[PDB]
Amino acid sequence: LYAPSALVLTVGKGVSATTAAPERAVTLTCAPGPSGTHPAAGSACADLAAVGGDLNALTRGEDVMCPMVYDPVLLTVDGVWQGKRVSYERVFSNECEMNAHGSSVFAF
Amino acid sequence: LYAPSALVLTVGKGVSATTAAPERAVTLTCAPGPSGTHPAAGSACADLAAVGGDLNALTRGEDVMCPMVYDPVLLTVDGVWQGKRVSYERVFSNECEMNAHGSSVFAF
């Protein structure tokens, strides 16, 4: 047995789970190994591990430059990270911004 | 694009998400096809489809017989079923009981 690490991330244009339909959704597994529908299971897993599973501490790439659009996107993440239950959601100003937090966690 | 179907199911001995640590956790994908860490991705997918994604309507196999133990187990399911957000959790009297609701959805 190992502490489980399994998550489902969903993104949709909107500003809250009540007003943003889930357009895309990927599963992500990091224990015992990185797998799932996520485009970059490996790097995503590494992104989370480095930050200690703390989604909120994923940094915004200083050099990454995004156009100043205001087209909100709601990101949700649910499941278990190393035996601990996860339930997170954040609204980004635009996808480019979302995809700029952590190299590959949210880039799906 | 297709309406997404991606879920994470977790089970732990306890009676509420606050008091039941996630011991095991499996991801399940049903669109465009059945996949994930779930032991029976295919049948599980079929179990859900038949019931219209309505977890609460999964039936208890009339013939399935379980010993009368009282060792509760909390089952949680989160994610998206056919474009609609899912967030469900139910406490069973014992694993044998949990595994008796729907042939293979919860049998993991």
Side-chain angles (χ1 to χ4, degrees), chain A residues 1-8 10-12 16-29 35-37 74 76 78-80 83-85, chain B residues 1-8 10-12 16-29 35-37 74 76 78-80 83-85:
Chain A
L1 277 142
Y2 40 95
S5 285
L7 303 155
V8 285
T10 80
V11 67
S16 78
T18 290
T19 84
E23 303 184 355
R24 263 170 294 137
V26 285
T27 50
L28 185 64
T29 285
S35 79
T37 53
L74 176 77
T76 71
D78 297 290
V80 296
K84 191 201 331 303
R85 299 193 155 132
Chain B
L1 277 142
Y2 40 95
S5 285
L7 303 155
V8 285
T10 80
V11 67
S16 78
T18 290
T19 84
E23 303 184 355
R24 263 170 294 137
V26 285
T27 50
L28 185 64
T29 285
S35 79
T37 53
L74 176 77
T76 71
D78 297 290
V80 296
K84 191 201 331 303
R85 299 193 155 132

Short mmCIF file of all heavy atoms in Angstrom, two decimals, chain A residues 1-8 10-12 16-29 35-37 74 76 78-80 83-85, chain B residues 1-8 10-12 16-29 35-37 74 76 78-80 83-85:
data_model
loop_
_atom_site.label_atom_id
_atom_site.label_comp_id
_atom_site.label_asym_id
_atom_site.label_seq_id
_atom_site.Cartn_x
_atom_site.Cartn_y
_atom_site.Cartn_z
N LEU A 1 0.88 -1.21 0.00
CA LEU A 1 0.00 0.00 0.00
C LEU A 1 0.89 1.22 0.00
O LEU A 1 1.98 1.19 0.58
CB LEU A 1 -0.86 0.06 1.26
CG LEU A 1 -2.17 -0.73 1.36
CD1 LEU A 1 -2.36 -1.32 2.78
CD2 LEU A 1 -3.35 0.16 0.94
N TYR A 2 0.40 2.29 -0.61
CA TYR A 2 1.11 3.55 -0.68
C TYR A 2 0.06 4.62 -0.44
O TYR A 2 -1.13 4.34 -0.52
CB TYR A 2 1.76 3.72 -2.07
CG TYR A 2 0.88 3.25 -3.21
CD1 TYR A 2 0.05 4.13 -3.91
CD2 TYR A 2 0.85 1.90 -3.56
CE1 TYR A 2 -0.80 3.68 -4.93
CE2 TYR A 2 0.01 1.45 -4.58
CZ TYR A 2 -0.81 2.34 -5.26
OH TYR A 2 -1.61 1.87 -6.27
N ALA A 3 0.49 5.82 -0.05
CA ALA A 3 -0.45 6.92 0.15
C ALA A 3 -0.93 7.24 -1.26
O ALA A 3 -0.12 7.47 -2.17
CB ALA A 3 0.26 8.08 0.75
N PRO A 4 -2.24 7.22 -1.48
CA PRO A 4 -2.72 7.51 -2.84
C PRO A 4 -2.56 8.95 -3.35
O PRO A 4 -2.52 9.90 -2.56
CB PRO A 4 -4.18 7.06 -2.77
CG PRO A 4 -4.56 7.36 -1.35
CD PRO A 4 -3.34 6.94 -0.55
N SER A 5 -2.41 9.08 -4.67
CA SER A 5 -2.29 10.36 -5.39
C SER A 5 -3.04 10.22 -6.72
O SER A 5 -2.52 9.66 -7.67
CB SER A 5 -0.83 10.71 -5.67
OG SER A 5 -0.18 11.17 -4.51
N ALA A 6 -4.28 10.69 -6.73
CA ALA A 6 -5.14 10.61 -7.90
C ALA A 6 -6.04 11.86 -7.89
O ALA A 6 -6.73 12.14 -6.89
CB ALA A 6 -5.97 9.36 -7.86
N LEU A 7 -6.04 12.56 -9.02
CA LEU A 7 -6.76 13.81 -9.22
C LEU A 7 -7.48 13.91 -10.57
O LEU A 7 -7.13 13.18 -11.51
CB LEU A 7 -5.74 14.95 -9.18
CG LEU A 7 -4.87 15.09 -7.93
CD1 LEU A 7 -3.59 15.81 -8.31
CD2 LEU A 7 -5.62 15.86 -6.85
N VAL A 8 -8.54 14.74 -10.61
CA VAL A 8 -9.31 15.08 -11.84
C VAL A 8 -9.31 16.60 -11.92
O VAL A 8 -9.72 17.30 -10.97
CB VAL A 8 -10.83 14.63 -11.91
CG1 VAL A 8 -10.95 13.16 -12.17
CG2 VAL A 8 -11.60 15.02 -10.68
N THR A 10 -10.55 19.95 -14.11
CA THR A 10 -11.51 20.39 -15.12
C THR A 10 -11.37 21.90 -15.34
O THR A 10 -11.11 22.64 -14.39
CB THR A 10 -12.97 20.06 -14.74
OG1 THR A 10 -13.45 21.04 -13.82
CG2 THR A 10 -13.10 18.68 -14.13
N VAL A 11 -11.52 22.35 -16.58
CA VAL A 11 -11.42 23.77 -16.90
C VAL A 11 -12.62 24.15 -17.74
O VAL A 11 -13.09 23.34 -18.55
CB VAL A 11 -10.11 24.11 -17.65
CG1 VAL A 11 -10.07 23.49 -19.04
CG2 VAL A 11 -9.92 25.59 -17.73
N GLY A 12 -13.15 25.34 -17.51
CA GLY A 12 -14.30 25.81 -18.26
C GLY A 12 -14.30 27.32 -18.21
O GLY A 12 -13.80 27.90 -17.26
N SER A 16 -17.14 30.68 -11.64
CA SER A 16 -17.45 29.89 -10.46
C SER A 16 -17.99 28.56 -10.96
O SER A 16 -18.52 28.49 -12.07
CB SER A 16 -18.52 30.58 -9.62
OG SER A 16 -19.81 30.40 -10.20
N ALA A 17 -17.90 27.51 -10.13
CA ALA A 17 -18.33 26.18 -10.53
C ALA A 17 -19.80 26.11 -10.92
O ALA A 17 -20.21 25.22 -11.66
CB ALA A 17 -18.03 25.19 -9.45
N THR A 18 -20.57 27.07 -10.42
CA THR A 18 -22.00 27.14 -10.72
C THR A 18 -22.22 27.74 -12.10
O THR A 18 -23.15 27.33 -12.80
CB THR A 18 -22.75 28.00 -9.66
OG1 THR A 18 -22.79 27.31 -8.40
CG2 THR A 18 -24.18 28.30 -10.09
N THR A 19 -21.34 28.67 -12.50
CA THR A 19 -21.43 29.36 -13.80
C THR A 19 -20.39 29.00 -14.87
O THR A 19 -20.24 29.74 -15.85
CB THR A 19 -21.33 30.90 -13.63
OG1 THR A 19 -19.95 31.30 -13.58
CG2 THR A 19 -22.04 31.36 -12.38
N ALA A 20 -19.63 27.93 -14.68
CA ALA A 20 -18.62 27.56 -15.66
C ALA A 20 -18.73 26.09 -15.94
O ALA A 20 -18.37 25.27 -15.11
CB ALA A 20 -17.21 27.90 -15.14
N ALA A 21 -19.27 25.74 -17.09
CA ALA A 21 -19.43 24.36 -17.48
C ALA A 21 -18.06 23.70 -17.72
O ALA A 21 -17.13 24.35 -18.22
CB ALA A 21 -20.28 24.29 -18.71
N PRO A 22 -17.89 22.42 -17.30
CA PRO A 22 -16.62 21.72 -17.50
C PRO A 22 -16.45 21.36 -18.95
O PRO A 22 -17.06 20.40 -19.41
CB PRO A 22 -16.78 20.47 -16.65
CG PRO A 22 -18.25 20.24 -16.64
CD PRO A 22 -18.81 21.61 -16.48
N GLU A 23 -15.59 22.08 -19.67
CA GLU A 23 -15.38 21.81 -21.09
C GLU A 23 -14.38 20.69 -21.31
O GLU A 23 -14.58 19.83 -22.16
CB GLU A 23 -14.89 23.06 -21.81
CG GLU A 23 -15.78 24.28 -21.70
CD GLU A 23 -15.27 25.46 -22.53
OE1 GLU A 23 -14.16 25.38 -23.14
OE2 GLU A 23 -16.00 26.48 -22.57
N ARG A 24 -13.27 20.75 -20.58
CA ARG A 24 -12.24 19.73 -20.68
C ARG A 24 -11.98 19.17 -19.28
O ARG A 24 -12.14 19.88 -18.28
CB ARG A 24 -10.97 20.37 -21.24
CG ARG A 24 -10.76 20.19 -22.72
CD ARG A 24 -9.62 21.06 -23.16
NE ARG A 24 -10.01 22.46 -23.01
CZ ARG A 24 -9.23 23.42 -22.51
NH1 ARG A 24 -7.99 23.15 -22.12
NH2 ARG A 24 -9.70 24.65 -22.43
N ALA A 25 -11.56 17.91 -19.20
CA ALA A 25 -11.30 17.25 -17.92
C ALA A 25 -10.25 16.15 -18.07
O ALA A 25 -10.41 15.24 -18.89
CB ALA A 25 -12.59 16.66 -17.38
N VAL A 26 -9.17 16.21 -17.29
CA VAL A 26 -8.14 15.18 -17.33
C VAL A 26 -7.85 14.53 -15.96
O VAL A 26 -7.83 15.21 -14.93
CB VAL A 26 -6.82 15.73 -17.84
CG1 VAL A 26 -6.87 15.95 -19.31
CG2 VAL A 26 -6.48 16.99 -17.11
N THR A 27 -7.64 13.22 -15.95
CA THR A 27 -7.30 12.54 -14.69
C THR A 27 -5.77 12.54 -14.59
O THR A 27 -5.08 12.59 -15.62
CB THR A 27 -7.85 11.08 -14.63
OG1 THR A 27 -7.49 10.35 -15.80
CG2 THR A 27 -9.36 11.05 -14.47
N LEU A 28 -5.25 12.52 -13.37
CA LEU A 28 -3.80 12.51 -13.14
C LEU A 28 -3.46 11.63 -11.95
O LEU A 28 -3.99 11.82 -10.85
CB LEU A 28 -3.31 13.92 -12.86
CG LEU A 28 -1.82 14.11 -12.70
CD1 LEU A 28 -1.11 13.79 -14.00
CD2 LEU A 28 -1.55 15.58 -12.27
N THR A 29 -2.55 10.68 -12.16
CA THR A 29 -2.11 9.77 -11.11
C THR A 29 -0.60 9.94 -10.92
O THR A 29 0.15 10.01 -11.90
CB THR A 29 -2.46 8.30 -11.48
OG1 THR A 29 -3.86 8.08 -11.30
CG2 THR A 29 -1.66 7.30 -10.66
N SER A 35 0.64 8.70 -14.42
CA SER A 35 -0.18 8.21 -15.52
C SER A 35 -1.49 8.98 -15.52
O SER A 35 -1.68 9.87 -14.68
CB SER A 35 -0.39 6.70 -15.43
OG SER A 35 -1.39 6.33 -14.49
N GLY A 36 -2.36 8.68 -16.48
CA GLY A 36 -3.66 9.35 -16.61
C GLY A 36 -3.89 10.01 -17.97
O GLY A 36 -3.00 9.99 -18.83
N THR A 37 -5.06 10.61 -18.17
CA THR A 37 -5.37 11.26 -19.45
C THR A 37 -4.63 12.57 -19.64
O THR A 37 -4.55 13.09 -20.75
CB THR A 37 -6.89 11.49 -19.67
OG1 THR A 37 -7.49 12.19 -18.56
CG2 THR A 37 -7.58 10.18 -19.87
N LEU A 74 -12.33 28.91 -15.22
CA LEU A 74 -12.33 28.29 -13.91
C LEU A 74 -11.60 26.96 -13.94
O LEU A 74 -11.92 26.08 -14.76
CB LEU A 74 -13.76 28.06 -13.39
CG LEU A 74 -13.80 27.31 -12.04
CD1 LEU A 74 -13.45 28.23 -10.88
CD2 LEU A 74 -15.16 26.69 -11.78
N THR A 76 -10.65 23.62 -11.73
CA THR A 76 -10.95 22.84 -10.52
C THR A 76 -10.03 21.60 -10.47
O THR A 76 -9.62 21.08 -11.52
CB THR A 76 -12.38 22.34 -10.46
OG1 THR A 76 -12.57 21.31 -11.43
CG2 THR A 76 -13.35 23.46 -10.66
N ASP A 78 -9.76 17.98 -7.93
CA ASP A 78 -10.31 17.18 -6.85
C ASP A 78 -9.65 15.82 -6.77
O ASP A 78 -9.06 15.36 -7.74
CB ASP A 78 -11.81 17.00 -7.04
CG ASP A 78 -12.55 18.31 -7.00
OD1 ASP A 78 -12.65 18.90 -5.91
OD2 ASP A 78 -13.03 18.75 -8.06
N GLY A 79 -9.72 15.19 -5.60
CA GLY A 79 -9.12 13.88 -5.43
C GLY A 79 -8.22 13.78 -4.21
O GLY A 79 -8.45 14.46 -3.20
N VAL A 80 -7.17 12.97 -4.32
CA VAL A 80 -6.24 12.78 -3.21
C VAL A 80 -4.79 13.01 -3.58
O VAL A 80 -4.35 12.54 -4.63
CB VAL A 80 -6.36 11.35 -2.65
CG1 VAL A 80 -7.74 11.13 -2.06
CG2 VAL A 80 -6.17 10.35 -3.76
N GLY A 83 -2.39 10.65 0.09
CA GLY A 83 -3.26 10.30 1.19
C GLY A 83 -4.11 11.40 1.77
O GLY A 83 -4.92 11.15 2.67
N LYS A 84 -3.95 12.62 1.28
CA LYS A 84 -4.75 13.72 1.78
C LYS A 84 -5.75 14.20 0.72
O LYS A 84 -5.39 14.38 -0.45
CB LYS A 84 -3.84 14.86 2.18
CG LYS A 84 -4.52 15.94 2.95
CD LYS A 84 -3.69 17.21 2.86
CE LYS A 84 -2.19 16.90 2.66
NZ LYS A 84 -1.58 16.04 3.74
N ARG A 85 -7.01 14.40 1.12
CA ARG A 85 -8.06 14.85 0.21
C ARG A 85 -7.81 16.27 -0.27
O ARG A 85 -7.45 17.17 0.51
CB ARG A 85 -9.43 14.76 0.87
CG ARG A 85 -9.75 13.35 1.25
CD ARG A 85 -11.18 13.13 1.61
NE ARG A 85 -11.48 11.72 1.38
CZ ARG A 85 -12.10 10.93 2.24
NH1 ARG A 85 -12.53 11.42 3.39
NH2 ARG A 85 -12.31 9.66 1.94
N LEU B 1 -14.60 17.64 -29.97
CA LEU B 1 -14.90 17.79 -28.52
C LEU B 1 -16.06 16.87 -28.19
O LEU B 1 -16.93 16.66 -29.02
CB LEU B 1 -15.33 19.22 -28.18
CG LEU B 1 -14.29 20.32 -27.94
CD1 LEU B 1 -14.76 21.66 -28.54
CD2 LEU B 1 -13.99 20.43 -26.43
N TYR B 2 -16.06 16.38 -26.96
CA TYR B 2 -17.11 15.50 -26.47
C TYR B 2 -17.40 15.97 -25.05
O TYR B 2 -16.60 16.71 -24.48
CB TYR B 2 -16.64 14.04 -26.47
CG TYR B 2 -15.20 13.87 -26.03
CD1 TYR B 2 -14.88 13.57 -24.70
CD2 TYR B 2 -14.15 14.05 -26.93
CE1 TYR B 2 -13.54 13.47 -24.28
CE2 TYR B 2 -12.82 13.94 -26.52
CZ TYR B 2 -12.53 13.65 -25.20
OH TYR B 2 -11.21 13.52 -24.83
N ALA B 3 -18.57 15.63 -24.52
CA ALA B 3 -18.90 15.99 -23.15
C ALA B 3 -17.96 15.13 -22.32
O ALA B 3 -17.90 13.90 -22.48
CB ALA B 3 -20.32 15.64 -22.86
N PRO B 4 -17.17 15.75 -21.45
CA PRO B 4 -16.24 14.95 -20.64
C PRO B 4 -16.85 14.03 -19.58
O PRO B 4 -17.94 14.28 -19.07
CB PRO B 4 -15.31 16.02 -20.05
CG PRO B 4 -16.22 17.20 -19.88
CD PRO B 4 -17.07 17.19 -21.13
N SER B 5 -16.15 12.92 -19.31
CA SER B 5 -16.51 11.91 -18.29
C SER B 5 -15.21 11.42 -17.64
O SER B 5 -14.51 10.58 -18.20
CB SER B 5 -17.24 10.72 -18.91
OG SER B 5 -18.57 11.05 -19.23
N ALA B 6 -14.88 12.00 -16.50
CA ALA B 6 -13.67 11.68 -15.76
C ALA B 6 -13.99 11.83 -14.27
O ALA B 6 -14.47 12.89 -13.83
CB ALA B 6 -12.55 12.59 -16.17
N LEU B 7 -13.68 10.77 -13.52
CA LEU B 7 -13.95 10.66 -12.09
C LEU B 7 -12.79 10.06 -11.28
O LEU B 7 -11.92 9.39 -11.85
CB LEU B 7 -15.14 9.73 -11.92
CG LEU B 7 -16.45 10.08 -12.62
CD1 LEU B 7 -17.25 8.81 -12.84
CD2 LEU B 7 -17.24 11.09 -11.80
N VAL B 8 -12.75 10.40 -9.98
CA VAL B 8 -11.80 9.84 -8.99
C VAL B 8 -12.65 9.31 -7.84
O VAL B 8 -13.48 10.03 -7.25
CB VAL B 8 -10.74 10.84 -8.33
CG1 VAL B 8 -9.64 11.18 -9.28
CG2 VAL B 8 -11.40 12.08 -7.80
N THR B 10 -12.64 7.38 -4.13
CA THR B 10 -11.79 7.06 -2.98
C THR B 10 -12.62 6.35 -1.91
O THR B 10 -13.80 6.66 -1.72
CB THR B 10 -11.13 8.31 -2.36
OG1 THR B 10 -12.08 8.98 -1.52
CG2 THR B 10 -10.65 9.28 -3.42
N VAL B 11 -12.02 5.37 -1.23
CA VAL B 11 -12.71 4.63 -0.18
C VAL B 11 -11.81 4.60 1.04
O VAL B 11 -10.59 4.54 0.91
CB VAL B 11 -13.06 3.18 -0.61
CG1 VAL B 11 -11.81 2.33 -0.81
CG2 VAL B 11 -13.98 2.55 0.37
N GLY B 12 -12.41 4.72 2.22
CA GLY B 12 -11.66 4.69 3.46
C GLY B 12 -12.59 4.27 4.57
O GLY B 12 -13.79 4.49 4.47
N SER B 16 -17.45 9.75 7.53
CA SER B 16 -17.58 11.06 6.91
C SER B 16 -16.21 11.43 6.37
O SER B 16 -15.20 10.94 6.89
CB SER B 16 -18.02 12.10 7.94
OG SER B 16 -16.91 12.50 8.75
N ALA B 17 -16.16 12.31 5.37
CA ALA B 17 -14.90 12.70 4.75
C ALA B 17 -13.90 13.31 5.72
O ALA B 17 -12.70 13.29 5.48
CB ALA B 17 -15.16 13.63 3.60
N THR B 18 -14.42 13.84 6.82
CA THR B 18 -13.58 14.44 7.85
C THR B 18 -12.95 13.36 8.71
O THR B 18 -11.80 13.52 9.15
CB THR B 18 -14.42 15.40 8.76
OG1 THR B 18 -14.79 16.57 8.01
CG2 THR B 18 -13.63 15.84 9.98
N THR B 19 -13.67 12.25 8.92
CA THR B 19 -13.20 11.13 9.75
C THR B 19 -12.80 9.83 9.03
O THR B 19 -12.69 8.79 9.68
CB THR B 19 -14.28 10.71 10.79
OG1 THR B 19 -15.21 9.80 10.19
CG2 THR B 19 -15.01 11.91 11.34
N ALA B 20 -12.66 9.85 7.72
CA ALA B 20 -12.29 8.65 6.99
C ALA B 20 -11.18 8.97 6.03
O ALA B 20 -11.40 9.62 5.03
CB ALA B 20 -13.50 8.08 6.24
N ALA B 21 -9.97 8.55 6.36
CA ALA B 21 -8.82 8.79 5.52
C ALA B 21 -8.93 8.00 4.20
O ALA B 21 -9.45 6.88 4.18
CB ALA B 21 -7.58 8.40 6.26
N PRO B 22 -8.52 8.62 3.07
CA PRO B 22 -8.59 7.93 1.77
C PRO B 22 -7.52 6.87 1.69
O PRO B 22 -6.36 7.19 1.47
CB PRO B 22 -8.31 9.05 0.77
CG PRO B 22 -7.47 10.00 1.54
CD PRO B 22 -8.12 10.03 2.89
N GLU B 23 -7.91 5.60 1.82
CA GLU B 23 -6.94 4.51 1.77
C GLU B 23 -6.61 4.10 0.35
O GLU B 23 -5.45 3.86 0.01
CB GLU B 23 -7.45 3.29 2.52
CG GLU B 23 -7.82 3.52 3.98
CD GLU B 23 -8.24 2.23 4.70
OE1 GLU B 23 -8.33 1.15 4.04
OE2 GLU B 23 -8.47 2.32 5.93
N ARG B 24 -7.64 3.96 -0.47
CA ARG B 24 -7.48 3.59 -1.86
C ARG B 24 -8.17 4.65 -2.73
O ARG B 24 -9.15 5.26 -2.30
CB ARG B 24 -8.11 2.23 -2.10
CG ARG B 24 -7.15 1.07 -2.07
CD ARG B 24 -7.94 -0.21 -2.06
NE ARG B 24 -8.68 -0.31 -0.81
CZ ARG B 24 -9.94 -0.71 -0.70
NH1 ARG B 24 -10.64 -1.08 -1.77
NH2 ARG B 24 -10.51 -0.76 0.49
N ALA B 25 -7.67 4.86 -3.95
CA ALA B 25 -8.22 5.85 -4.86
C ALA B 25 -7.98 5.47 -6.33
O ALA B 25 -6.83 5.24 -6.72
CB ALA B 25 -7.59 7.21 -4.59
N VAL B 26 -9.03 5.38 -7.13
CA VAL B 26 -8.89 5.06 -8.55
C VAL B 26 -9.52 6.10 -9.49
O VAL B 26 -10.60 6.64 -9.21
CB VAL B 26 -9.53 3.73 -8.88
CG1 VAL B 26 -8.69 2.60 -8.38
CG2 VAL B 26 -10.91 3.66 -8.31
N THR B 27 -8.85 6.40 -10.60
CA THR B 27 -9.42 7.34 -11.57
C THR B 27 -10.21 6.50 -12.57
O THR B 27 -9.92 5.31 -12.77
CB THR B 27 -8.32 8.17 -12.31
OG1 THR B 27 -7.30 7.32 -12.84
CG2 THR B 27 -7.68 9.19 -11.39
N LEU B 28 -11.25 7.10 -13.17
CA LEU B 28 -12.08 6.41 -14.15
C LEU B 28 -12.49 7.36 -15.27
O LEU B 28 -13.05 8.43 -15.02
CB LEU B 28 -13.34 5.89 -13.49
CG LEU B 28 -14.28 5.05 -14.34
CD1 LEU B 28 -13.59 3.77 -14.76
CD2 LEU B 28 -15.55 4.74 -13.52
N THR B 29 -12.22 6.96 -16.51
CA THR B 29 -12.57 7.76 -17.68
C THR B 29 -13.52 6.95 -18.56
O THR B 29 -13.29 5.76 -18.79
CB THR B 29 -11.29 8.16 -18.47
OG1 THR B 29 -10.59 9.20 -17.76
CG2 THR B 29 -11.61 8.61 -19.89
N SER B 35 -11.13 4.01 -19.56
CA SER B 35 -9.74 3.84 -19.18
C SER B 35 -9.57 4.38 -17.77
O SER B 35 -10.54 4.84 -17.16
CB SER B 35 -8.79 4.52 -20.18
OG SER B 35 -8.70 5.92 -20.00
N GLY B 36 -8.35 4.29 -17.23
CA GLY B 36 -8.04 4.75 -15.88
C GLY B 36 -7.45 3.68 -14.96
O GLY B 36 -7.31 2.52 -15.37
N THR B 37 -7.11 4.04 -13.73
CA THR B 37 -6.53 3.08 -12.79
C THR B 37 -7.54 2.08 -12.26
O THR B 37 -7.18 1.05 -11.70
CB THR B 37 -5.79 3.75 -11.59
OG1 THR B 37 -6.63 4.70 -10.92
CG2 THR B 37 -4.55 4.42 -12.09
N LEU B 74 -16.41 4.79 3.86
CA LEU B 74 -16.88 5.96 3.14
C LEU B 74 -16.42 5.92 1.69
O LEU B 74 -15.21 5.78 1.41
CB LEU B 74 -16.39 7.27 3.78
CG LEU B 74 -16.79 8.53 2.97
CD1 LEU B 74 -18.25 8.88 3.20
CD2 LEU B 74 -15.93 9.72 3.34
N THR B 76 -16.31 8.04 -1.84
CA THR B 76 -16.47 9.35 -2.47
C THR B 76 -16.21 9.23 -3.98
O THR B 76 -15.42 8.38 -4.42
CB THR B 76 -15.53 10.41 -1.93
OG1 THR B 76 -14.20 10.14 -2.37
CG2 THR B 76 -15.60 10.48 -0.44
N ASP B 78 -15.82 12.09 -7.35
CA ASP B 78 -15.77 13.47 -7.81
C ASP B 78 -15.33 13.56 -9.25
O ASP B 78 -14.71 12.64 -9.77
CB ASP B 78 -14.82 14.27 -6.94
CG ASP B 78 -15.26 14.34 -5.50
OD1 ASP B 78 -16.27 15.02 -5.22
OD2 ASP B 78 -14.61 13.70 -4.65
N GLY B 79 -15.67 14.66 -9.91
CA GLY B 79 -15.29 14.85 -11.30
C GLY B 79 -16.44 15.24 -12.20
O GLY B 79 -17.39 15.91 -11.76
N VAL B 80 -16.40 14.79 -13.45
CA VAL B 80 -17.45 15.12 -14.41
C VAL B 80 -18.04 13.91 -15.10
O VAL B 80 -17.30 13.01 -15.51
CB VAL B 80 -16.90 16.05 -15.51
CG1 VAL B 80 -16.48 17.38 -14.90
CG2 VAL B 80 -15.68 15.43 -16.14
N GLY B 83 -20.15 15.93 -19.13
CA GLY B 83 -20.24 17.37 -19.06
C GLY B 83 -20.85 17.96 -17.81
O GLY B 83 -20.89 19.19 -17.66
N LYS B 84 -21.34 17.12 -16.91
CA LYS B 84 -21.93 17.62 -15.69
C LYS B 84 -21.05 17.28 -14.48
O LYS B 84 -20.58 16.15 -14.34
CB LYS B 84 -23.30 17.01 -15.52
CG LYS B 84 -24.12 17.65 -14.44
CD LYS B 84 -25.21 16.69 -14.01
CE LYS B 84 -25.62 15.75 -15.16
NZ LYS B 84 -26.10 16.44 -16.41
N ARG B 85 -20.82 18.27 -13.61
CA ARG B 85 -20.00 18.08 -12.41
C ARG B 85 -20.65 17.12 -11.42
O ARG B 85 -21.86 17.21 -11.15
CB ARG B 85 -19.70 19.41 -11.73
CG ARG B 85 -18.96 20.32 -12.64
CD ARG B 85 -18.37 21.51 -11.96
NE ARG B 85 -17.23 21.96 -12.76
CZ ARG B 85 -17.02 23.21 -13.12
NH1 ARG B 85 -17.84 24.17 -12.72
NH2 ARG B 85 -15.97 23.52 -13.87
#
